[PDB]
């Protein structure tokens, strides 16, 4: 079987992308954030504290003929930026782009933190990292990827994120139309639950490639590209008005500048991030300063290849028994 869905950015800054998922019978369509950096499928529901629900579409398990309560099971989760939800667990039918998995655990939010309630466009997350990260207790539950791999035509999914435009997630096959050249694969380490990989180094604009290990995560559900402090300083040294700003949290530069591109190594291949992609957007509407799309991971503690990075590529998540990550230029 395969599956194909359109992913759209939630805003004019590509902060995140949503893809419609059909849960339950008859189908309730929610717009989820497909997050290769977590392993929980969770939804705003008829269970969610009312005062914590603003604009989102909810999942009502009571109207799904296929839903069953997974008895005893709870979950609680916090993320990178501070936000957090918890609740209880149903299994139900979940379809993405026509690919259908039955008995999928669908974590029902009893409570959500303020940044979730504030973002009217995301109805939940669908986790696509390794199932070892799943927060359901006392028995952890598999991701929709894991649950679908018995039926996929191949055990893979691809992410084809657009620049201020829609794109695609595909499951179970590789669209040889969506990219140029060939894919290069590099090994993944599952030791901490992530899509974790070693980039072989980096170049700024038309300057030399520097061979340096940079270990990190491919995270479709982090907005930016978070690099070690010295690699980031090397990049913004090339843009004359950029500075580290304590007030805004990171490197800012005149919206006026033409930013150099940023190249990252995948084994012997190179993916170039065009410099327009690293212009994140102005700091406030009408400002003359712009927020940099490449920031220090020093705070976060681990390097994340975020949407700024992955949206310049075509990316294959190879979930075979030994997984690999594939990048191609597009």
């Amino acid at each position: 079987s395969t599956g194909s869905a359109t992913t759209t950015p939630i805003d004019s800054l590509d902060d995140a992308y949503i893809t419609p998922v059909q849960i339950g019978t008859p189908a309730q369509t929610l717009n989820l954030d497909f997050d290769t950096g977590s392993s929980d499928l969770w939804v705003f529901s008829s269970e969610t504290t009312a005062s914590e629900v603003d604009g989102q579409t909810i999942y009502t398990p009571s109207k799904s003929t296929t839903a069953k309560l997974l008895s005893g099971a709870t979950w609680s989760i916090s993320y990178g930026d501070g936000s957090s939800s918890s609740g209880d667990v149903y299994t139900d039918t979940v379809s993405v782009g026509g690919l259908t998995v039955t008995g999928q655990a669908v974590e029902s939010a009893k409570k959500v933190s303020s940044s979730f309630t504030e973002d009217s466009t995301i109805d939940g997350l669908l986790g696509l990292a390794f199932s070892t990260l799943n927060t359901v207790s006392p028995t952890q539950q598999k991701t929709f990827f894991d649950n679908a791999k018995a039926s996929l035509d191949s055990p893979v999914f691809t992410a084809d994120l657009g620049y201020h435009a829609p794109g695609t997630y595909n499951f179970g096959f590789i669209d040889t139309t969506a990219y140029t050249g060939s894919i290069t694969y590099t090994a993944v380490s599952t030791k901490q639950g992530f899509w974790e990989w070693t980039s072989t180094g980096y170049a700024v604009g038309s300057g030399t490639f520097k061979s340096t290990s940079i270990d990190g995560i491919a995270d479709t559900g982090t907005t930016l590209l978070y690099l070690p402090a010295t690699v980031v300083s090397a990049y913004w040294a090339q843009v004359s008005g950029a500075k580290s700003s304590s007030s805004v949290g990171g490197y800012v530069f005149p919206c006026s500048a033409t930013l150099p591109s940023f190249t990252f190594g995948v084994g012997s291949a190179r993916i170039v991030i065009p410099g327009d992609y690293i212009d994140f957007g102005p700091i406030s509407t009408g400002s003359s300063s712009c927020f940099g799309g490449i920031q220090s991971s020093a705070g976060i503690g681990i390097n994340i290849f975020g949407d700024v990075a992955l949206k310049a590529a075509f990316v294959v998540f190879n979930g075979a028994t030994t997984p690999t990550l594939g990048f191609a230029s597009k």
Binding site: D15, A16, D33, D35, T36, G37, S38, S39, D40, I77, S78, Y79, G80, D81, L125, G127, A129, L133, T135, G193, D219, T220, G221, T222, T223, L224, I300, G301, I302, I304
Partner: peptide, 6 residues
């Protein structure tokens, strides 16, 4: 922005 399971 947003940083998704730290």
């Amino acid at each position: 922005x947003v940083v998704x399971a730290x």
